[PDB]
């Protein structure tokens, strides 16, 4: 960052050229240069560089609770008159611990996109896709192609019969109640895997492959968001945007994302960012400039949404959004997505069965795992990992210094042993089996807290597991004569 200018990060699938046009208008009126960038993995780079992060970060709201907890985002305090211009639902997406941590921009949900020439009557159920694919294959076409590398696209099907991320009850999420390995989640993922086994879909289909096949008239349907419509408009394919197919008679339940713009807590340009976001971007003209490049979906700005909702594609986006639910913005969402991404990729490739893939995802979707030990005794912490993925990497055990501090290295593999506070920590790695083991001797309350098992590569560290060490009292420490009769 540099004082007197704005650097913005936004994902490569969004209208970054339209956003740059709003930046050009801001520069024309004020002299302030606005640079819009679309780095790869920007959502993973942001917490590592936020140092030299951007002034503004755009992403769906699900990642922002984690950034806010880490102290990376400035609290936003728009006037009541400004808050009244955006929908209360969109403000709900960006409120964390009672404070607003980003400006909401647009509401997104996946829909079924279909080729009206190949399929004038798209299927209402997922169950009828195998027979439809057989008929289309006889004509050199396929029924459906969509991104199988990101769990966001398969989640509507996994959630349809009962899968869920974190149980919700009266404005709160229970982070201990995860629904990744229930009967409904297994049924949805088994249906997806059966589509691949029967050659109705390919496990390696990604965003680019599905978009190219649909936009070239090779597949009758795709599953995508509003941002994808402008490339289809250019392709001249006669497309429709409609309700996703049902599974076991239940609607598919897409996770609803609210594209949001957070202000970096370390930015010396917070006031410029606020003026740009409130008075340039979040205006009917500003949002239209972005929408014209890549559609936003249902915008957070009431005045513009009242017009956009007349677009049948936007009404279809809201119909699918209403069948699903808003993603939580809680810090625990990252772990949930990483676990489900792994389960889908492994089940689709045949590397794991659906049952084993979802059992591992259920365990790993929990951001932290408690390891309880008794004071004065030894505690063995286990960190399973993918031996192939982490082949050749050294490992580390680090202790989290508060909610916002660094994870401070304790021991690593090749100082693998550390004696401190009359106790000790030793790390051992079974590289063939994929199990990292940390042994804490003479466990005491001073050892309680959050730690990470890590896999190192270059100057980066991958989190293998977050562990909460809990220390039960030594039974002898309460030595007394109990009551008798």
Ligand X SMILES: OC[C@H]1O[C@H](O[C@H]2[C@H](O)[C@@H](O)[C@@H](O[C@H]3[C@H](O)[C@@H](O)[C@@H](O)O[C@@H]3CO)O[C@@H]2CO)[C@H](O)[C@@H](O)[C@@H]1O
Per CB under 6 A, 80 contacts ligand V5S: no
Q: How far is the CB of 264 from ligand V5S (least distance, A)?
A: 36
Contact pick of 54, 65, 122, 257 for ligand X (by CB under 6 A): 257
- Cα torsion through 290, 293, 297, 301, rounded to 10: 20
Question: Which run of H or of E encompasses 308?
Answer: helix 302-308
Per CB under 6 A, 338 contacts ligand X: yes
Q: How far is the CB of 206 from ligand V5S (least distance, A)?
A: 16
CB closer to ligand X, 336 vs 371: 336
CB closer to ligand X, 75 vs 150: 150
Contact pick of 388, 459, 460, 479 for ligand V5S (by CB under 6 A): 388
247's contact among ligand X, ligand V5S, none, with CB below 5 to 8 A by partner kind, is none
338's contact among ligand V5S, ligand X, none, with CB below 5 to 8 A by partner kind, is ligand X
d(CA 327, CA 423): 42
Over its C-alpha atoms, the chain yields an Rg (Å, rounded) of: 25
Per CB under 6 A, 108 contacts ligand X: yes
**CB neighbour list of residue 35: distance below 8 Å, 6 or more residues apart:** 5, 6, 7, 8, 23
- Find out whether 360 and 330 touch, Cβ atoms under 8 Å: no
Per CB under 6 A, 206 contacts ligand X: no
Contact pick of 1, 11, 17, 435 for ligand X (by CB under 6 A): 11
Q: How far is the CB of 353 from ligand X (least distance, A)?
A: 21
d(CA 301, CA 285): 11
Q: What are phi and psi of 6, to 5 degrees?
A: -125, 130
By rule CB under 6 A, what string of x and - marks binding of each residue 14-53 to ligand X? -----------------------------xx---------
Measured on CA atoms in the order 434, 440, 443, 449, is the torsion positive or negative? negative
- Find out whether 361 and 378 touch, Cβ atoms under 8 Å: no
Residue with tokens 């500003």: 286
Which 172-201 residues touch ligand V5S, going by CB under 6 A? none
d(CA 116, CA 37): 36
CB closer to ligand X, 364 vs 425: 364
Question: Which run of H or of E encompasses 438?
Answer: strand 435-441
Per CB under 6 A, 432 contacts ligand V5S: no
- Find out whether 264 and 74 touch, Cβ atoms under 8 Å: yes
Per CB under 6 A, 63 contacts ligand X: yes
420 is in an annotated binding site: yes
- Find out whether 445 and 465 touch, Cβ atoms under 8 Å: no
Q: How far is the CB of 361 from ligand V5S (least distance, A)?
A: 16
Both tokens of 77, joined, read 């305090």
Q: How far is the CB of 390 from ligand V5S (least distance, A)?
A: 12
96, burial (CB in 10 Å: exposed 0-12, middle 13-18, buried 19+):
buried
CB closer to ligand V5S, 79 vs 388: 388
d(CA 279, CA 458): 43
CB closer to ligand X, 257 vs 295: 257
d(CA 384, CA 434): 6
431 is in an annotated binding site: yes
Question: Which run of H or of E encompasses 347?
Answer: helix 333-349
Q: How far is the CB of 242 from ligand X (least distance, A)?
A: 19
Residue with tokens 């950034």: 67
44's contact among ligand X, ligand V5S, none, with CB below 5 to 8 A by partner kind, is ligand X
By rule CB under 6 A, what string of x and - marks binding of each residue 347-386 to ligand X? ----------------------------------------
Closest among 241, 239, 219, 232 to 143, alpha carbons compared: 219
Per CB under 6 A, 161 contacts ligand X: no
Count, residues near ligand X per rule CB under 6 A: 17
388's contact among ligand X, ligand V5S, none, with CB below 5 to 8 A by partner kind, is ligand V5S
- Cα torsion through 48, 49, 53, 57, rounded to 10: -10
- The per-type count for the chain, helices as H runs and strands as E runs, is 16, 24
Both tokens of 229, joined, read 């419509």
Per CB under 6 A, 62 contacts ligand X: yes
Q: How far is the CB of 329 from ligand X (least distance, A)?
A: 10
Which 349-378 residues touch ligand V5S, going by CB under 6 A? 351
CB closer to ligand V5S, 388 vs 476: 388
- Give residues in contact with ligand X (CB under 6 A): 11, 13, 43-44, 60, 62-63, 108, 150-152, 225, 257, 334, 337-338, 341
Which parts are annotated binding residues?
414, 420, 431
Q: Could you list the residues that contact ligand V5S (CB under 6 A)? A: 351, 388
């Amino acid at each position: 960052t540099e004082e007197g200018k704005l650097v913005i990060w936004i994902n490569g699938d969004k209208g970054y050229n339209g956003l740059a046009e709003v930046g050009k208008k801001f520069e024309k009126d004020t002299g302030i240069k606005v640079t819009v960038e679309h780095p790869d993995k920007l959502e993973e780079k942001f917490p590592q560089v936020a140092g030299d992060g951007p002034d503004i970060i755009f992403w769906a709201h699900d990642r922002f609770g984690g950034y806010a907890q880490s102290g990376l985002l400035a609290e936003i305090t728009p006037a009541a008159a400004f808050q009244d211009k955006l929908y209360p639902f969109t403000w709900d997406a960006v409120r964390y611990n009672g404070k607003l941590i980003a400006y909401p921009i647009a509401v997104e949900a996946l829909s079924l996109i279909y080729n009206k020439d190949l399929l004038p009557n798209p299927p209402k159920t997922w169950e009828e896709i195998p027979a439809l694919d057989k008929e289309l294959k006889a004509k050199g076409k396929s029924a459906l192609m969509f991104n199988l590398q990101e769990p966001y696209f398969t989640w509507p099907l996994i959630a349809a019969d009962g899968g869920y991320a974190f149980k919700y009850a009266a404005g709160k999420y229970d982070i201990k109640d995860v629904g990744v390995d229930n009967a409904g989640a297994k049924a949805g993922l088994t249906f997806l895997v059966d589509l691949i086994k029967n050659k109705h879909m390919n496990a390696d289909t990604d965003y680019s492959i599905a978009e190219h096949a649909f936009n070239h008239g090779e597949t009758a349907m795709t599953i995508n968001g509003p941002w994808a419509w402008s490339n289809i408009d250019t392709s001249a394919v006669n497309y429709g945007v409609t309700v996703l197919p049902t599974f076991k008679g239940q609607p598919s339940k897409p996770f609803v994302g609210v594209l949001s713009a957070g202000i970096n807590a370390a930015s010396p340009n917070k006031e410029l960012a606020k003026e740009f976001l409130e008075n340039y971007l979040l205006t009917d003209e500003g949002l239209e400039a972005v929408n014209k490049d890549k559609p936003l979906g249902a915008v957070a700005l009431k005045s513009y949404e009242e017009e956009l909702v007349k677009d049948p594609r936007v009404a279809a986006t809201m119909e699918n959004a209403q069948k699903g639910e808003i993603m939580p913005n809680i810090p625990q969402m990252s772990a949930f997505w990483y676990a489900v991404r792994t389960a889908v990729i492994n089940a689709a490739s045949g590397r794991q069965t659906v049952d084993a893939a979802l059992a591992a995802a259920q365990t790993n979707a929990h951001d932290t795992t408690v390891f309880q030990g008794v004071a004065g005794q030894s505690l063995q912490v286990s960190c399973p990992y993918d031996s192939m993925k982490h082949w050749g990497r050294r490992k580390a055990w680090c202790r989290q210094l508060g909610e916002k501090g660094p994870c401070q290295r304790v021991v690593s593999t090749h100082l693998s042993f550390l004696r401190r506070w009359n106790g000790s920590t030793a790390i051992t790695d079974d590289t063939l089996g994929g199990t990292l083991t940390i042994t804490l001797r003479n466990l005491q309350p001073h050892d309680a807290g959050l730690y990470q098992c890590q896999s190192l590569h270059g100057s980066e560290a991958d989190t293998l597991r977050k562990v909460l060490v809990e220390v039960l009292a030594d039974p002898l420490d309460h030595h007394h004569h109990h009551h008798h009769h």
